[PDB]
Write a protein that binds this DNA or RNA. Sequence first.
RNA 1: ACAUAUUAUUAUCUUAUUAUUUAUAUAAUAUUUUUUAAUAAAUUUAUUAAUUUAUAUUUAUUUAUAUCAGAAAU
RNA 2: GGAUUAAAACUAGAGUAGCGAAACGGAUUCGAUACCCGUGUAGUUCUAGUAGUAAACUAUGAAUACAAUUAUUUAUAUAUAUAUAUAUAAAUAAUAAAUGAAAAUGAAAGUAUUCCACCUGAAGAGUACGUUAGCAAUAAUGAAACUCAAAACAAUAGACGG
RNA 3: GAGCGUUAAUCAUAAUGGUUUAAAGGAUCCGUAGAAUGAAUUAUAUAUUAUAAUUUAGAGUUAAUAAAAUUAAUUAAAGAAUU
RNA 4: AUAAGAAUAUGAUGUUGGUUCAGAUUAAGCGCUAAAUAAGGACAUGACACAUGCGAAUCAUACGUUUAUUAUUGAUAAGAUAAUAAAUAUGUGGUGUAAACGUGAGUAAUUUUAUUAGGAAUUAAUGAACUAUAGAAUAAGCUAAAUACUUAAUAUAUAAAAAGGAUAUAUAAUAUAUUUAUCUAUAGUCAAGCCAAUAAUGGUUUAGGUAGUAGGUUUAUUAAGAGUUAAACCUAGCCAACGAUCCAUAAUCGAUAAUGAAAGUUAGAACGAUCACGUUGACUCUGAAAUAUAGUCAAUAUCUAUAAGAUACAGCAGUGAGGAAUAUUGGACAAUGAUCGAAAGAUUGAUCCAGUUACUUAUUAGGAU
Lengths: 235, 53
Amino acid sequence: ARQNFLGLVVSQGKMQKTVKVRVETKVFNKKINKELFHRRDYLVHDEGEISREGDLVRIEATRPLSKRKFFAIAEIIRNKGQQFALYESEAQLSVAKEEAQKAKEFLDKRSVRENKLNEKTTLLRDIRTIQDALSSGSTPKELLEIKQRYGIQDFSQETVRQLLQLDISGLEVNLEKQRSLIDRIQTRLSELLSNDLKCDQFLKDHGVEDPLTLKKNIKKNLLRKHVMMDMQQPS
Amino acid sequence: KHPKGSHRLSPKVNFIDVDNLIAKTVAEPQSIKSSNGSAQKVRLQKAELRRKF
RNA sequence: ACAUAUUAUUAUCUUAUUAUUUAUAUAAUAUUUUUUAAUAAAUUUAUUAAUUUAUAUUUAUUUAUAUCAGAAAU
RNA sequence: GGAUUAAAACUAGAGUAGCGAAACGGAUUCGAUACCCGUGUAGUUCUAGUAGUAAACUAUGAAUACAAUUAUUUAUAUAUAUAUAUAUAAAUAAUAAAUGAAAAUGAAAGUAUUCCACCUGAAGAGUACGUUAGCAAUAAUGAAACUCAAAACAAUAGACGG
RNA sequence: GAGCGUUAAUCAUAAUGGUUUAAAGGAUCCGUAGAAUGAAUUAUAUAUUAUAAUUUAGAGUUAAUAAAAUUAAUUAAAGAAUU
RNA sequence: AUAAGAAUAUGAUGUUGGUUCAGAUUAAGCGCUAAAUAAGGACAUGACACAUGCGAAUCAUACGUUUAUUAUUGAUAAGAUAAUAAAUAUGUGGUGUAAACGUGAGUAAUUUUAUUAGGAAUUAAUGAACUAUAGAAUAAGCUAAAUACUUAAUAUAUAAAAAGGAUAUAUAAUAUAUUUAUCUAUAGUCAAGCCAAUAAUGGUUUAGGUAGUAGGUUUAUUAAGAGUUAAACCUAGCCAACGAUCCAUAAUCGAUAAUGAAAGUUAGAACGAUCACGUUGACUCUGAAAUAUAGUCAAUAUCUAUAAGAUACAGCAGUGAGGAAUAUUGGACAAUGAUCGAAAGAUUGAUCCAGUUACUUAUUAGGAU
Ligand SMILES: [K+]
Ligand SMILES: [K+]
Ligand SMILES: [K+]
Ligand SMILES: [K+]
Ligand SMILES: [K+]
Ligand SMILES: [K+]
Ligand SMILES: [K+]
Ligand SMILES: [K+]
Ligand SMILES: [K+]
Ligand SMILES: [K+]
Ligand SMILES: [K+]
Ligand SMILES: [K+]
Ligand SMILES: [K+]
Ligand SMILES: [K+]
Ligand SMILES: [K+]
Ligand SMILES: [K+]
Ligand SMILES: [Mg+2]
Ligand SMILES: [Mg+2]
Ligand SMILES: [Mg+2]
Ligand SMILES: [Mg+2]
Ligand SMILES: [Mg+2]
Ligand SMILES: [Mg+2]
Ligand SMILES: [Mg+2]
Ligand SMILES: [Mg+2]
Ligand SMILES: [Mg+2]
Ligand SMILES: [Mg+2]
Ligand SMILES: [Mg+2]
Ligand SMILES: [Mg+2]
Ligand SMILES: [Mg+2]
Ligand SMILES: [Mg+2]
Ligand SMILES: [Mg+2]
Ligand SMILES: [Mg+2]
Ligand SMILES: [Mg+2]
Ligand SMILES: [Mg+2]
Ligand SMILES: [Mg+2]
Ligand SMILES: [Mg+2]
Ligand SMILES: [Mg+2]
Ligand SMILES: [Mg+2]
Ligand SMILES: [Mg+2]
Ligand SMILES: [Mg+2]
Ligand SMILES: [Mg+2]
Ligand SMILES: [Mg+2]
Ligand SMILES: [Mg+2]
Ligand SMILES: [Mg+2]
Ligand SMILES: [Mg+2]
Ligand SMILES: [Mg+2]
Ligand SMILES: [Mg+2]
Ligand SMILES: [Mg+2]
Ligand SMILES: [Mg+2]
Ligand SMILES: [Mg+2]
Ligand SMILES: [Mg+2]
Ligand SMILES: [Mg+2]
Ligand SMILES: [Mg+2]
Ligand SMILES: [Mg+2]
Ligand SMILES: [Mg+2]
Ligand SMILES: [Mg+2]
Ligand SMILES: [Mg+2]
């Protein structure tokens, strides 16, 4: 049959309807006693100009098409070259949109900081008026303004404590919950495995059919999936 | 797309029908011609042997 | 340095031959075509030599391109 | 392919104490274009460049896996009845095995794997010619003929040593 | 041995090699090609290769903690001595 | 599967390292020497120049031409006609020389070689010349005549042909029969064109090369693809340090020869395959195929007939030259082939034999006492 080769497109878009394909064949080199790969670039006809640099293609022998062209593209085995072209165009649009959004979020942050620098009022001073007015009874209009600078309509000892909250405090509680879950899951499964009877019951209670007839790994995974379905789904 | 001016498929294999090959190559004489001549008789014998072979 | 021989090349010069392509002929031949003599046969027809007519096939000269080779330069 | 690359050298502009090619003198010597002494120019210095060469040496390309000990430091860690002790790495020193022409190497010059550079008698020769690069000195690349049966390394025993 | 010798030639006769010290490590590193070499498991295939999925022992990224004050470039200073 | 080393360093030792030797061989030469026979080889050099003779002819059953005899005709013999037997290849025709033979100049590959269970454009109304089968073979002209040539007729969009001769018999030139030729068609056989992949010496102290160059589109040309050639218009490519381009050198190869344990290396004389060439260059004609050992023109050399002439030994033998060196100006067509012829036969320096030469191989070249 017609001689067919597999190769990588190494040049495209330089000649009209012609691409350069790199074909590698296996040969034996008697001198060094080693089976080597021999490489050759083929000028190949691309009637539809579909192939792109980087594509893996199969080329088939044809009639003479020019001084040096004797093969044509017969199939695109892998279209990595075509993918490269599509992803580059999308990237330009995708990145422009993201950069526009980030540029607007930077100017907004700058405006807020500039606005705050125009308000001579300071947190410490404001928190020293909400704690003196709340301990003296005075209600100068500054407080009403302070009830707008911060949004704190009510001036109580439990409102300054909520104006000065630090994110670290929230992190400290999320971390304790995370540690609890892991510790509970491990103790639960550890105990369950120690008692085969309580384990068999555990599985049946959660909806396993004849858990007794199961393997150690085929069933410990069920136990693990259940212990993690009784401490993460209920919570 | 295959190259313009080229056949997409390979030419069909030509299978020989031995009955048709024999009929066209070594066909039998259509009539039993009168080979009274010495040279006609020799030619008839040679043609018969060649056709048999 | 250089004096030699050999080969190659060319925006050059000259060029046999050939191919291809131009223009021209009161060009030749055949046929057609228009007439015209001479001759012949018969009692219009044929032939030959001319002229007119187109057609095909050649010829001479001519235009252009390429070309063995030689010259010059490298 | 690229970059960096001692000393000397070169192109400009500064600097110039000391040192110091050369040069001119003083000695030494049979002679002394030397060793020693004097006067001491370039250079040695700085700024901006050129150039890409050294015994540019561990005369030992880089990477990975692996193999028997000791000593000594260093680092990290651990412990305590708190200052040592116990661990794991690195470096260095001396070694086993192994390798080697041997001298020796010793975690490689061992056991293996991968990649690069390089060599094929001496002399001629890192010369000639050409080419490339540089302001230049030069640098890179780099032969052949002729001639010879030499030539070289480690080690051994001597002889000799101002 | 009806040849023998000699000259001219061909093949064989050590790389089942080497480069600290004998010819031979590139001044050094960076890195391109390499038709150079190169991890793990599983499944396919047309099979020491290809593809896919998965993995972290090579190679990297960012932090945390501890440690160290050297090497480049630049700027600003000090010192003994010399003439 | 078959793998050996030796001499030479050094005061001595070990090692590095070259040099040389032991083996086989030749397209061999030379020196000395030499018996017969059988077989295999023989200008590697100047693709230098060549005296002389040969190497391609054959057909009379294509057409003409020339005799003799006999018969008939011709009232005197010049001629004619037919039969018979001869002659003619200095007239017109046919077939044969694209092979074979010789040589290795050119050729490093758009061309050449080798290989592949390769390919398409998806290769002509090509048969070259045999086989099988079928059909056809007509009319004029031109020549002295024809199987010469020309123009027509009819034969698979349809296109595209031809030829008679010999011998008998019967007829009144014609017809049959036999024989040998001509033309067309279909298939077979033999045999052609084109393309791809892979391999094919040295120098980069030849590093850049290319400009129809790389690709696209269209026409011309061809049986047929393609910057293969020619014309037009576009794109800016293509090759290259895994060595481009350039230069030098060389015919290539094997189931051939030499050598080695082998991988290999060498040769390319001999046997065989392939290519190129026939003093040099280009071009054209015929043809399926030729830049043909043809033709045309030119170049170089020679010759005689002095013409827009002939010849060119790389066919055989042979000569001069060059060289260290390579043979007979032989016999035969008996054999195997080739060409011509219907046949009888003719031709064949293909070929087969012999000669010369230890160039190679082999056998023999007296045994017992
Ligand atoms: K084309
Ligand atoms: K490099
Ligand atoms: K100074
Ligand atoms: K050193
Ligand atoms: K290296
Ligand atoms: K060594
Ligand atoms: K000696
Ligand atoms: K030796
Ligand atoms: K001899
Ligand atoms: K005849
Ligand atoms: K000959
Ligand atoms: K040749
Ligand atoms: K007949
Ligand atoms: K080259
Ligand atoms: K010969
Ligand atoms: K014969
Ligand atoms: Mg010319
Ligand atoms: Mg200066
Ligand atoms: Mg001095
Ligand atoms: Mg520099
Ligand atoms: Mg130097
Ligand atoms: Mg050096
Ligand atoms: Mg140093
Ligand atoms: Mg590294
Ligand atoms: Mg130099
Ligand atoms: Mg020594
Ligand atoms: Mg003998
Ligand atoms: Mg060997
Ligand atoms: Mg090494
Ligand atoms: Mg080094
Ligand atoms: Mg060195
Ligand atoms: Mg890591
Ligand atoms: Mg010998
Ligand atoms: Mg003989
Ligand atoms: Mg010869
Ligand atoms: Mg006759
Ligand atoms: Mg004749
Ligand atoms: Mg021939
Ligand atoms: Mg007729
Ligand atoms: Mg006639
Ligand atoms: Mg004819
Ligand atoms: Mg005709
Ligand atoms: Mg040179
Ligand atoms: Mg074309
Ligand atoms: Mg071309
Ligand atoms: Mg053109
Ligand atoms: Mg030659
Ligand atoms: Mg060979
Ligand atoms: Mg050869
Ligand atoms: Mg011969
Ligand atoms: Mg020829
Ligand atoms: Mg010629
Ligand atoms: Mg000729
Ligand atoms: Mg000649
Ligand atoms: Mg001869
Ligand atoms: Mg002589
Ligand atoms: Mg003869």
